[PDB]
Amino acid sequence: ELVNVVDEKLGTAYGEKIDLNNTNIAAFIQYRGLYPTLAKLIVKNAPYESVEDVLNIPGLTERQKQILRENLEHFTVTEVETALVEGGDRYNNGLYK
């Protein structure tokens, strides 16, 4: 019954897409027009029940909504894992260049 939760999360869609509830913010660099404004809003307003709920962040302009709709296919939502979101690891997980 002892399982590494990070490996199991790598077995889910967290290992293929950007998890809005769990992924570190720097991964939002790998898609156009997300880092840092939209990425900060997404990480701040997490968790989300579904991916489309990211279109309900209060304060988004129409351009930001269009960018989010364009990048919606790269987004997944898994359950919040404590190990990835504790200690402020969504903003700084210790992985620099």
Binding site: I29, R32, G33, L34, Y35, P36, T37, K97
Partner: protein, 137 residues
């Protein structure tokens, strides 16, 4: 292997036009890069923000695209964030902020073109070593 004009051919604008730098242009671009940018951009990475680098793909995914000479010169004139929403000339060297960043004071248009050409040519020479950090040292 030599520094052929095929290596020194880099996209000039976002339309698709290119430019063939001379060897002297590349050498002066490398020297000016060491003079003004290398203290934080040594090897194609960013010391004060390692999430961003100077790889051509990362510059291409920036808004506006920075994987060409004109985009890089525009960044050296009016630097922005990665999404382009916010101007960061007060914390990044530029022609606007030459008063607070005095190493940008005597940088001409040709100097900015040379630095941009060095930035766009170094990945073509070095591989993933450019912007890859200590893993590829």
């Amino acid at each position: 292997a030599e520094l052929t004009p095929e290596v020194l051919t880099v996209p000039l604008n976002s339309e698709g036009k290119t430019i063939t730098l001379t060897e002297k242009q590349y050498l002066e671009g490398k020297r000016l890069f060491q003079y003004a940018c290398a203290s934080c951009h040594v090897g194609g990475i960013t010391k004060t923000n390692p999430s961003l680098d100077l790889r051509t793909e990362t510059l291409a995914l920036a808004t506006p695209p920075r994987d060409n000479i004109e985009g890089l010169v525009d960044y050296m004139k009016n630097p922005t964030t990665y999404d382009g929403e916010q101007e960061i000339a007060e914390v990044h060297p530029s022609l606007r902020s030459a008063d607070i960043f005095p190493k940008m004071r005597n940088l001409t248009e040709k100097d900015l073109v040379a630095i941009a050409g060095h930035i766009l040519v170094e990945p073509k020479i070095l591989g993933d070593k450019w912007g890859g950090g200590k893993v590829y040292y």
